[PDB]
Design a protein around this motif. Structure first.
Motif, PDB file in Angstrom:
ATOM      1  N   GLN A   1      -1.256   7.173  -1.804  1.00 33.71           N
ATOM      2  CA  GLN A   1      -2.233   7.935  -2.773  1.00 33.71           C
ATOM      3  C   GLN A   1      -3.886   7.651  -2.842  1.00 33.71           C
ATOM      4  O   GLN A   1      -4.757   8.266  -2.521  1.00 33.71           O
ATOM      5  CB  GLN A   1      -1.683   7.873  -4.307  1.00 33.71           C
ATOM      6  CG  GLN A   1      -2.336   8.493  -5.309  1.00 33.71           C
ATOM      7  CD  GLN A   1      -1.589   8.720  -6.809  1.00 33.71           C
ATOM      8  OE1 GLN A   1      -0.318   7.976  -6.717  1.00 33.71           O
ATOM      9  NE2 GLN A   1      -1.734   9.256  -8.001  1.00 33.71           N
TER      10      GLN A   1
ATOM     11  N   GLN B   1      -6.794   9.599  -1.992  1.00 32.69           N
ATOM     12  CA  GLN B   1      -7.972  10.244  -2.717  1.00 32.69           C
ATOM     13  C   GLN B   1      -9.651   9.576  -1.556  1.00 32.69           C
ATOM     14  O   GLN B   1     -10.585  10.457  -1.311  1.00 32.69           O
ATOM     15  CB  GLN B   1      -8.466   9.377  -3.688  1.00 32.69           C
ATOM     16  CG  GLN B   1      -7.212  10.254  -5.024  1.00 32.69           C
ATOM     17  CD  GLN B   1      -6.167   9.651  -4.816  1.00 32.69           C
ATOM     18  OE1 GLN B   1      -5.241  11.162  -4.654  1.00 32.69           O
ATOM     19  NE2 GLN B   1      -5.500   8.678  -4.642  1.00 32.69           N
TER      20      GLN B   1
ATOM     21  N   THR C   1      -9.842  12.572   0.472  1.00 32.97           N
ATOM     22  CA  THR C   1     -11.010  13.123   0.155  1.00 32.97           C
ATOM     23  C   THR C   1     -12.475  13.291  -0.621  1.00 32.97           C
ATOM     24  O   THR C   1     -12.839  14.225  -0.284  1.00 32.97           O
ATOM     25  CB  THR C   1      -9.894  13.944  -1.642  1.00 32.97           C
ATOM     26  OG1 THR C   1     -10.137  12.949  -2.376  1.00 32.97           O
ATOM     27  CG2 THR C   1      -8.303  14.531  -1.293  1.00 32.97           C
ATOM     28  N   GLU C   2     -12.734  11.730  -1.074  1.00 29.52           N
ATOM     29  CA  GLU C   2     -14.254  11.903  -1.498  1.00 29.52           C
ATOM     30  C   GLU C   2     -14.985  11.521   0.047  1.00 29.52           C
ATOM     31  O   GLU C   2     -16.095  12.308  -0.362  1.00 29.52           O
ATOM     32  CB  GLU C   2     -13.744  10.699  -2.028  1.00 29.52           C
ATOM     33  CG  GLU C   2     -13.481   9.988  -3.457  1.00 29.52           C
ATOM     34  CD  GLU C   2     -13.758  11.802  -4.221  1.00 29.52           C
ATOM     35  OE1 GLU C   2     -14.803  12.149  -3.630  1.00 29.52           O
ATOM     36  OE2 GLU C   2     -12.968  11.905  -5.087  1.00 29.52           O
TER      37      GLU C   2
END
Lengths: 50, 48
Positions: A28, A32, A35-36
């Motif tokens: 996870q 993230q 994505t960031e």
């Protein structure tokens, strides 16, 4: 032999639960992070457009 | 003798389950190291 194997099974499953939790956490986290990173690219893009 | 045979069969089944769990665990730890490295790399990317 049976009892020793059962004890090994128990400790093995203990560490398996530990590492499964760690795997969920880190997968996870990587999700993230990627994505960031993409969103940071979007942000530089917008600023440069401005 | 027969009880010994049957209990040893059960022990061998236990061992099969244990080693199946063990190969699963090896896959899991490989995934753990790979994912830590991926997280760090993408974090550095985001820092840039």
């Amino acid at each position: 032999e049976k009892d020793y194997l059962q004890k090994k099974y128990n400790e093995l499953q203990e560490e398996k639960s530990k590492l499964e939790a760690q795997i969920n956490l880190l997968t996870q986290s990587l999700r993230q992070t990627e994505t960031e990173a993409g969103r940071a690219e979007i942000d530089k893009r917008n600023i440069e457009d401005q | 003798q027969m009880a010994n045979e049957l209990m040893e069969r059960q022990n061998i089944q236990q061992i099969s389950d244990n080693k199946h769990i063990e190969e699963q665990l090896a896959e899991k730890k490989a995934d753990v190291e790979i994912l830590k490295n991926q997280v760090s790399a993408f974090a550095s990317d985001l820092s840039s």
